Symmetry: D2
Amino acid sequence: DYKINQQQIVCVASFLSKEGKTEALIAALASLIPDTRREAGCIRYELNVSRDEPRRVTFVEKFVDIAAFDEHCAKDAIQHYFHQVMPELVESFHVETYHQVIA
Amino acid sequence: DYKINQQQIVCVASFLSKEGKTEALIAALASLIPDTRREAGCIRYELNVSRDEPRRVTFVEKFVDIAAFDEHCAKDAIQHYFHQVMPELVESFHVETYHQVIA
Amino acid sequence: DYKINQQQIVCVASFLSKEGKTEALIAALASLIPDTRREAGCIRYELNVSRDEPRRVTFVEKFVDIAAFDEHCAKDAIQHYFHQVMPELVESFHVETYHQVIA
Amino acid sequence: DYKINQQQIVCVASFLSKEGKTEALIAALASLIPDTRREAGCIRYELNVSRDEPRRVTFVEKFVDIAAFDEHCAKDAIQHYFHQVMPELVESFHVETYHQVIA
């Protein structure tokens, strides 16, 4: 009835901005998009703003495999975001990776 | 630099299974897919199993607009899942809707 | 076994460049992408270069409905491309619209 | 301004049915979908019926790379379709592969 795709990697990464930092956070995350979409192993890299918690900004991502996901995570702009940008703008966050279930 | 799409609706719905209920939960959620994909206003309806918390199963969804999302949520099989299936299989869950940010 | 989605609109539009005009054609078509992706009713707008006929450049598109497709086609940049750019760069072309079959 | 993704493979495959064979053709092509979507390297495999030429049925496809595309093309059901089904149902067809242009 269903089969788990054991190769492709899905990631959902949500970020809760600090008070007054939501526009800055959306801008910081959106700045990552053009180069990420140009990665050979990037399938999907979509940014989203919550209708329920307007401080929440979330990436919905897909990569051809875990090597491509790891390559993405080691990119300079991504590491700069985690190390330098995030501590100034974000209260809390959550990152989860997945395999897709095909039915 | 970016524009929020104010029409299309993104939804991320994550479900944490009870101990021993993960396979039953994946099956219950996967059973919803064929009819949902056949909804005129469904763009995306993808099921995913967590690599980090293997009891977690998550839908990543997109609909043409909020009317189409509301129509989906009122479907008999969806309401049956929430009302009848979920209480037996799920410890906790989270549903969040979003607008997509285009950069 | 399958259901045709009678609402959403798929379009495939292929363009065969004149000799020596392929890079100019890719550039002209790519210039349309950022504003099209920002259309409320645009789902997909992907540009592709043929591996089999390297003068061929093709858009693969999806819109929430025919009104959104018609809105896209009436945009100034799209009409400028058809009227002004295409006659200089393109030998021949084909545009086809579709409904998606869900199985 | 743009970058060609040299890894992922896009395919558009259109089939023009013989008179009276369109429903049979849609069914034959749709029968390929469930197993193809379950391929580890399949990203997209979408079937479409033409609004302009109702005998035309077209697949819009994407695979993680050329090895995954070649694997797909060598599958028993795909070869059975080409060799056994297509000659009975199809007047003419066209298959084109592409690399995606990211802008």
